[PDB]
A = this chain, B = another copy of it.
Amino acid sequence: AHIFVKPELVAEIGVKQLQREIVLPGLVWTNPLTDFGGSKNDTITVRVPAITTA
């Protein structure tokens, strides 16, 4: 019988271990505050503007 020496080939075709989709980071108000250095206790105060009545 004919006998041949062949390379066991390996391919990546797009089969990935199943892990959940990432949605929440895009849906949440992300990084409106950045200058967290140069702020006491890593805390940035957020000011909520005043409301007046007529």
**Which A residues have a C-beta under 8 Å from some C-beta of B?**
2, 5, 7-8, 40, 45, 47-48, 50
Contact = CB atoms under 8 A, between A and B. Distances in A.
Number of copies of this protein chain within its complex: 2
A50 B2 CA distance: 9
B8 A47 contact: no
Contact of A47 (B5, B40, B47, B48): B5
Contacts of A40: 8
Nearest to A10: B38
Nearest to A45: B5
6 contacts: A2-B50, A5-B45, A5-B47, A5-B48, A7-B45, A8-B40
A2 B49 CA distance: 12
